């Protein structure tokens, strides 16, 4: 049971390690998309203004 | 005394072993419940991933 516990603990740890990496990636997608959104929200006003 | 002293050593050995079986059975229950919880958590995390 200690062996199985250790194996499963490593699986949970390594799977959660990917979860936190994807959290940084998704956080980065938001950080970048927010910039593209900022630009888009100006081009739409320039288009309407022009 | 040299007679009872020997049988009481055995009695203490049995009682000690029983106290250790009670401990190991609980240790396995604890280990299993921790593993079962960790397995359900891992499954949920894979699903989330």
UniProtKB/Swiss-Prot annotation, chain A:
Subcellular location: Mitochondrion; Nucleus; Cytoplasm
Protein name: Beclin-1-C 35 kDa
Taxonomy of the source species: Eukaryota, Metazoa, Chordata, Craniata, Vertebrata
Gene transcribed to yield this protein: BECN1
Curated annotation (Swiss-Prot), chain B:
Subunit note: Forms homooligomers; homo-oligomerization is essential for the roles in membrane tethering and enhancement of SNARE-mediated fusion. Component of the PI3K (PI3KC3/PI3K-III/class III phosphatidylinositol 3-kinase) complex I (PI3KC3-C1) in which the core composed of the catalytic subunit PIK3C3, the regulatory subunit PIK3R4 and BECN1 is associated with ATG14. PI3KC3-C1 displays a V-shaped architecture with PIK3R4 serving as a bridge between PIK3C3 and the ATG14:BECN1 subcomplex. PI3KC3-C1 can associate with further regulatory subunits. Interacts with PIK3CB.
Name of the protein in question: Beclin 1-associated autophagy-related key regulator
Gene source species: Homo sapiens (Human)
Subcellular location per the Swiss-Prot or TrEMBL entry: Cytoplasm; Endoplasmic reticulum membrane; Preautophagosomal structure membrane; Cytoplasmic vesicle, Autophagosome membrane
Family from the record: Belongs to the ATG14 family.
Entire protein: shown range: 100 to 148 of 492
Note on domains (UniProt): The coiled-coil domain is required for BECN1- and PIK3C3-binding and for autophagy. The final 80 residues in the C-terminus define a minimum required region for autophagosome binding called BATS.
The organism's place on the tree of life at top rank: Eukaryota
Post-translational modification: Ubiquitinated via 'Lys-6', 'Lys-11' and 'Lys-63'-linked polyubiquitin chains on multiple lysines by MARCHF7, leading to ATG14 aggregation and loss of interaction with STX17.
């Amino acid at each position: 049971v200690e062996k199985n516990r250790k194996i499963v603990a490593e699986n949970l740890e390594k799977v959660q390690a990917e979860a936190e990496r994807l959290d940084q990636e998704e956080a980065q997608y938001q950080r970048e998309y927010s910039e593209f959104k900022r630009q888009q929200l100006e081009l739409d006003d320039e288009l309407k203004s022009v | 005394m040299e007679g009872k002293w020997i049988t009481d050593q055995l009695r203490w050995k049995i009682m000690s072993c029983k106290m250790r079986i009670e401990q190991l059975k609980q240790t396995i229950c604890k280990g299993n419940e921790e593993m079962e919880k960790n397995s359900e958590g891992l499954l949920k995390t894979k699903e989330k991933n």
